[PDB]
Symmetry: D2
Subunit: 234 residues, 4 copies
């Protein structure tokens, strides 16, 4: 199966979890893969992925390093066909205990960083390209002590609705991929909420990312695809 | 690729449009396919066009007794169902003030009642790791002039996916709604209507193991139509 | 006196939310017409409501009885300012056990009956009138053994999105009011209400009066720029 | 006649438009009203226009220290808050490709960060049986060209209502989002999209705010009430 044959894929935050599972899958599907990470752990990830995957150290939030990331991609690949944006950002604090630090860190990574990651990619984004933004079931549900994270992910999903109108006739699709909790006591409690009776696997999220990245989803844009075992559907 | 290798697929309403495109794609992906259609001539033409050993049964998907005959045939010839694609559709346009009992009855009998019993009667055959795909519509979550009966039927349709996944706890049966927008323009963010093969490709995603943690969901294939 | 000199027609108002709405609407100055299927129950409801409220025997699963309802309203009031379509209900069966009767009887009341209740009201609905449809949190959530009822309430909500386009320039607003769990065999009932309350962010089920108060908002001029909407009165239950 | 009799209401951003209309309605309904504005002259003019013993405090929500001063004055003068209508906010229009850090920061600092801290800092004063109303927007759940920053901020805003009601379990505080659509060349363009065929009046939004503030909405929490003439409903 070579469902991403001759496609250039850039994946931010692909050093672990969903990003890493996606990098592995995209390489397996024939993509020329560029991944980013902040820290070494990137070199290990690149070895684990293999298949000619290249790593670029970049702080996805930091603006000047994004310029350097896209300069490298332009020089080495000349275009982007798949952009998969995974942002870290997130911790738990209830209202009454929320700090400026938590707000700033979460939104800088999950919202601001994402906006500029995509904006700076625009000149490289080819006709028939696909931008996949990692959301969360948190963005449309209620969870105790999770309001800052949840709000950041609500903001994230909104981007897909709106940017598809700014990029009219450019042939760039933009979609949100929204996982429930995955494997990567608490897990037993979370699994009880899920209709399917278990938490997701990073690889299952990666398979859904593949759908959105691939030409199979050619008439899917502005959407939010939940990969949640039913958790946010009931 | 062979994403539905050794799978048994049943597709209701597969003699034209999206249903037909899905049957073609499912066969291409290695599925053993059973299809239904109301009319013999279009069904024979469809079976010929699909190829790949596809089998056709002339059945009205909304008629409960004919559903019994479909599933008797599937049981005898295949023994199980791994993929059920319920592609019931149809409706017409009447504004409030002009809605007839006929329009209501025909639309709901086919789009809601027929679907419920199609799935209910399939249950004994649905294997562990099976996937049920229900054809919804962008109409089910939007407003359109003179479309209220159809829109309401498709809203009911989508609800089924949220609820049946709870009735079938631990059975390993996923249920998802596939909701196309306009298919083969100015309102669509992508600036065009969708192609049948594009809806079929999304159907394949939901039918396949790639969607193994997707259930109760509504996947829009609408060029952004119902997303803005 | 927020419904002073308004004619309100409420279907299914002999108990629970409908009754609570009838009482509130009368308190707010409305001339209230209610429907119910059982004459003795209907009469007792009218006695409870008071304030000149009038009862008419009718089932929405019956289009002929709707015709008679509106003949009566036309003759006695000549118009409708507020139409609260609350008549409906359902039962529990899981997939595998759903009967034709459960499907038909639920949809005949909750969907078909609602459409014709509103359609047959159209000639009487004044400029500036408000139609309130009783939905449910069930219409947008998943609940075991509830698929027929849930689908009926999803259909119901869709009507508000669509009819507001059909009724372009008619000055008729259409909104869905969607209650969560409300306190509307006795040992089992108490145990289930406790489990329902545990789900609710507010930690209790709603009172019928609270749903009636939200119905009043939608019926009143305060909601003059609210149409096509679904107002949840659920203590947060379908919001999380 | 008096649906907010002897209630303390604090409205941020109430010197024009919806906020001002809400201040007038709340006063007419018997509330003791405190309003907030950024410009002292405008604030004083608003107070004179409102009457009914309404009191004004100069405050910017992009400034956490000025929120502290606001609640210091409310505590000193009223000792509690029963209704908190967080209406302060704004935005501007830029398409993806042209979004600036300033547009992002300035929008989120008021519409998201400022809202979070406005509510958090009110918590000690919020009485049992109190109501918090957050001004959202139809933009928060729709797509609009050149509007992605504002839209995302209002998606985040609505998320707060889903989540904070869990943080504040048993506190007797309701939190709801009030989401206006078009409200009074460009107006006629907006009006033709509205099912009701016109933009909303500020007084109509204020009436819906009153519902959420009042005891009539006692079993409404975590919700989003659209006051949009059908705009985002179709």
């Amino acid at each position: 199966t070579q469902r991403l044959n001759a496609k250039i894929a850039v994946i931010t935050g692909a050093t672990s979890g969903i990003g890493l599972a996606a990098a592995k899958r995209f390489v397996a599907e024939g993509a020329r893969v560029f991944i980013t990470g902040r820290r070494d752990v990137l070199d290990a990830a690149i070895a684990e992925i293999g298949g000619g995957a290249v790593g670029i150290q970049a702080d996805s939030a930091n603006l000047a390093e994004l310029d350097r990331l896209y300069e490298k991609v332009k020089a080495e690949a000349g275009r982007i066909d798949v952009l998969f944006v995974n942002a870290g950002g997130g911790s738990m604090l209830p209202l009454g205990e929320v700090t400026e630090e938590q707000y700033d860190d979460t939104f800088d990574r999950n919202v601001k960083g994402v906006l500029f990651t995509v904006q700076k990619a625009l000149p490289l984004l080819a006709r028939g390209s696909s931008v996949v933004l990692t959301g969360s079931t948190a963005g449309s549900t209620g969870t105790p002590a999770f309001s800052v994270y949840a709000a950041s992910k609500a903001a994230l999903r909104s981007f897909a609705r709106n940017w598809i109108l700014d990029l009219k006739d450019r042939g760039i699709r933009i979609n949100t991929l929204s996982p429930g909790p995955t494997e990567t006591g608490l897990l037993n409690a979370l699994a009880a909420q899920v209709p399917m009776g278990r938490v997701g696997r990073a690889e299952e999220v990666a398979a859904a990312a593949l759908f959105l990245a691939s030409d199979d989803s050619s008439f899917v844009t502005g959407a939010e695809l939940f990969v949640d075992g039913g958790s946010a559907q009931v």
